[PDB]
Amino acid sequence: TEEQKETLKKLKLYQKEYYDYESKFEYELFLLRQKYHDLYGPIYDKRREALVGAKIGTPNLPEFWLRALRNNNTVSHVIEDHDEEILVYLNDIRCDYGFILSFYFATNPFFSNSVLTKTYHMLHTEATVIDWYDNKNILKRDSFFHFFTSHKEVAQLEMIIEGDYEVALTIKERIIPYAVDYYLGII
Amino acid sequence: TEEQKETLKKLKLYQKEYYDYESKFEYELFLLRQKYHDLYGPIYDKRREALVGAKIGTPNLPEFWLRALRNNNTVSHVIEDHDEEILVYLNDIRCDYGFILSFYFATNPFFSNSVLTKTYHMLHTEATVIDWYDNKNILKRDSFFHFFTSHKEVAQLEMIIEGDYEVALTIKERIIPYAVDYYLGII
């Protein structure tokens, strides 16, 4: 009916209006997040300066990122005993804007890579293929480093992308912000 | 070692510093959310003015909130055929700051309540007990209105609070913001 139709025009009007504000919101929200990503930036670098100061990772406080990781519930699960002698070489873990997780390694017997990146587009993931040296491929079993695969009855294709994504977020949001607190065992 | 200890002091220092910024963040984040809750406010009222203009809900566009709800995947599940003749009496759904969901009803044959609220503390939920009139208690089976319970092998005590909380969020965040779009069947 036309009277109902007149109501509905008004309701569409108020809903567009709504969308205008939700727009300004998300915009003001992007702004706030970027503002603070750049405020964190410097602190992460200071931490990195301090630790990395060499052919062992984080020489000024050996095994840093390892214990940090070990002391996280979600991440500890994926980290096997045989991964540990590689992770001790980890210099820094960084995150850039979805996002690209970067793992910086000191020179090691295991691979030539100085950086293992993992990109999550937010859809598909892009991780750099590891440069395993001869007889040094620990994947030969389960390993934290199976993390560095690219992806896009199908339950196997969710679960892998479900648990691998859950790890990425932890690292992105728990480990990177509060690294030393995990290391201390105080979270 | 003392040299490692000096590193660790620095790392605690930079982590406090971090916490200072995450503080300012969340504060600037509260601000932004409140700013916009108050910007939405007026639009929700206009929508409510328009619809509610009576002994049937939303008289200027009958069955509004019902179709809005029906057209939501998550919520439609909990809404049974026998609930519908009550929901047609729903005038408005509002949300105040965790949060308190409010369902405003036109006078109906089913209960005396003009408002059924549900509070989620964010822990425990507090919903108002319905004032079922004699021989009008549709709970006597499953009903959307089982939603109006208070809560705090234990898998039953999560699942109930898990699915009931999922509904609340939808209503809070999907239905309330985009009500007319669900109604239209365009989301």
Side-chain angles (χ1 to χ4, degrees), chain A residues 82-147:
Chain A
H82 56 274
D83 295 330
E84 294 174 10
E85 56 169 31
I86 315 182
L87 289 161
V88 286
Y89 282 108
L90 197 45
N91 266 331
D92 197 42
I93 311 168
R94 280 171 85 267
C95 188
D96 322 283
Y97 281 144
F99 63 89
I100 184 258
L101 267 189
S102 326
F103 299 72
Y104 296 94
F105 290 83
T107 316
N108 51 90
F110 307 93
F111 48 77
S112 60
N113 287 119
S114 63
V115 195
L116 298 179
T117 73
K118 182 102 190 270
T119 310
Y120 284 84
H121 292 272
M122 254 164 51
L123 298 192
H124 76 104
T125 53
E126 303 167 75
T128 105
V129 50
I130 290 153
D131 277 329
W132 306 109
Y133 280 130
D134 189 28
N135 277 11
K136 255 48 244 289
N137 203 324
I138 56 151
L139 306 173
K140 267 103 164 173
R141 57 197 193 203
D142 292 315
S143 167
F144 165 69
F145 299 88
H146 270 126
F147 183 82

Side-chain angles (χ1 to χ4, degrees), chain A residues 3-5 7-8 10-12 14-15 17-19 21-22 24-25 28-29 32-33 35-36 39-40 43-44 46-47 50-51 59-62 64 176-181 183-184 187, chain B residues 3-5 7-8 10-12 14-15 17-19 21-22 24-25 28-29 32-33 35-36 39-40 43-44 46-47 50-51 59-62 64 176-181 183-184 187:
Chain A
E3 216 195 321
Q4 295 166 18
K5 279 174 193 166
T7 283
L8 189 64
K10 309 176 81 208
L11 265 62
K12 290 170 185 188
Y14 311 145
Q15 188 71 243
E17 193 190 356
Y18 180 90
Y19 287 143
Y21 283 122
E22 174 166 54
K24 280 162 188 61
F25 181 67
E28 301 227 277
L29 180 59
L32 203 47
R33 284 201 198 278
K35 184 179 176 220
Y36 281 79
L39 284 170
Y40 306 139
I43 300 157
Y44 296 150
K46 280 198 274 178
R47 176 217 277 160
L51 292 161
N60 300 348
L61 198 82
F64 183 70
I176 288 155
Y178 324 129
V180 73
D181 275 357
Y183 171 93
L184 283 153
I187 292 174
Chain B
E3 216 195 321
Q4 295 166 18
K5 279 174 193 166
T7 283
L8 189 64
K10 309 176 81 208
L11 265 62
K12 290 170 185 188
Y14 311 145
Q15 188 71 243
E17 193 190 356
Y18 180 90
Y19 287 143
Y21 283 122
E22 174 166 54
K24 280 162 188 61
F25 181 67
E28 301 227 277
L29 180 59
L32 203 47
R33 284 201 198 278
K35 184 179 176 220
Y36 281 79
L39 284 170
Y40 306 139
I43 300 157
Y44 296 150
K46 280 198 274 178
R47 176 217 277 160
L51 292 161
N60 300 348
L61 198 82
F64 183 70
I176 288 155
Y178 324 129
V180 73
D181 275 357
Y183 171 93
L184 283 153
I187 292 174

